[PDB]
Amino acid sequence: KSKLPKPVQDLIKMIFDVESMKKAMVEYEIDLQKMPLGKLSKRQIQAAYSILSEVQQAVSQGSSDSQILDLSNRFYTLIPHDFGMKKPPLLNNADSVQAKAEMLDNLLDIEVAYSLLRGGSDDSSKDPIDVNYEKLKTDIKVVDRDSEEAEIIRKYVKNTHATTHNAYDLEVIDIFKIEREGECQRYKPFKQLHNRRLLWHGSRTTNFAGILSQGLRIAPPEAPVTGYMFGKGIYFADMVSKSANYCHTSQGDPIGLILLGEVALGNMYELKHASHISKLPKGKHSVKGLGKTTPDPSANISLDGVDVPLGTGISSGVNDTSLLYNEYIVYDIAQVNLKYLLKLKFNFKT
């Protein structure tokens, strides 16, 4: 029977729940009868990535729209869906390709979690919570609610909830201090880079067994670079509600998980519109998507030598931008050092 703190036990139970994995796939309208969770495979997901890349190439290189029709149907054969009586969305425009790329990103970490679960060694004299905790290769400690860490983090949550994201209120349930094995050594070449910032990264709960196991990762080479607004990198935000929207919580599942990561941004290539890149020009270390609203810079606080942009939202004065709020993208996984994991309750306004 596990000795782990009860909040950590609840976390392990949440991120390894198999039925949550199936619910996520059903939410995507994937046919569970034809393609069960156990038949989901990494090379199958990579093959689906390549079809999206084929669609990307066929659209831009001026091929037949007829081929694009066939590539779309091939995607729905490779990944069986079940839209009941409705017509499955056609894969012929960037809008549809980006939605399927997002779906494959989620399937990729679901496969990592399920394979983690069904692998390794097993011992019936051990609590499955203890076994699954050790499979994450991550030290997880509860942050004291009255500590100054929690104070700064709660202030960060309190001040950076955008007015536009008015559908819900956020309530911090647990603050976890996490150390992924090996990630600190991997981050060492970037530890002294300038412009280090503590930024948010939200994701579906079904992704976090893979995120704690493997870290935040760049989409595989088969993934289409045009499937993501700023290409294939790791995305962060400085508004907690922007990243909280990527938790994709609902009134049925109102508990979300959000990361605080130390990100070495260096020289930021500042952009106002989409730019589908996989690498940066020499002398640039990150992309900053310029939003119309930014945390007030005069209110930046230092936490363990890292900037925390917890200022309240003010106009950035940035002219023509497709972004309401800022985005930060790095294109090297060694530029990220995950520090905290928050468990939030979404209180939806009605």
Q: Which stretch binds ligand 1WI (CB under 6 A): 84-92, 126-134, 227-235, 303-311?
A: 227-235
Site string for ligand 1WI, 66-95 (x = CB under 6 A): ------------------------------
As a whole number of angstroms, the distance between CA 215 and CA 110 comes to: 14
203 SS3 class: strand
- Residue 49 found at the interface with ligand 1WI (CB under 6 A): no
DSSP strand pairing (268-271 vs 336-348)? unpaired
- Residue 294 found at the interface with ligand 1WI (CB under 6 A): no
- Residue 236 found at the interface with ligand 1WI (CB under 6 A): yes
Query: What is the DSSP secondary-structure string of 30-63?
Result: B-TTTS-GGG--HHHHHHHHHHHHHHHHHHHTT-
As a whole number of angstroms, the distance between CA 108 and CA 111 comes to: 5
- Residue 338 found at the interface with ligand 1WI (CB under 6 A): no
For the record, the structure tokens of 239 come out as: 């508004």
20 SS3 class: helix
Asked if 327 is an active-site residue, the reply is: yes
- Residue 237 found at the interface with ligand 1WI (CB under 6 A): yes
Q: Among 48, 327, 331, 343, which residue sits at the site for ligand 1WI (rule: CB under 6 A)? A: 327
Window 181 to 220, contacts with ligand 1WI (CB under 6 A)? 200-203, 207, 211, 216-217, 219
As a whole number of angstroms, the distance between CA 152 and CA 53 comes to: 42
For the record, the structure tokens of 325 come out as: 């709020």
Query: 276: number of CA atoms within 13 Å, CB side?
Result: 11
As a whole number of angstroms, the distance between CA 113 and CA 106 comes to: 11
Crossing angle between the packed helical segments 42-60 and 65-78, to the nearest 10 degrees: 170
Window 106 to 125, contacts with ligand 1WI (CB under 6 A)? 108-109
Q: Among 16, 176, 246, 331, which residue sits at the site for ligand 1WI (rule: CB under 6 A)? A: 246
Q: Among 205, 226, 243, 335, which residue sits at the site for ligand 1WI (rule: CB under 6 A)? A: 243
Binding site feature residues for NAD(+) = 201-203, 210, 217, 243
Q: Which stretch binds ligand 1WI (CB under 6 A): 2-10, 33-41, 143-151, 236-244?
A: 236-244
Nearer to ligand 1WI, 114 or 129 (CB): 114
DSSP strand pairing (286-289 vs 268-271)? parallel
| Residues within the interface to ligand 1WI (CB under 6 A) | 105, 108-109, 200-203, 207, 211, 216-217, 219, 228, 233-237, 242-243, 246, 327
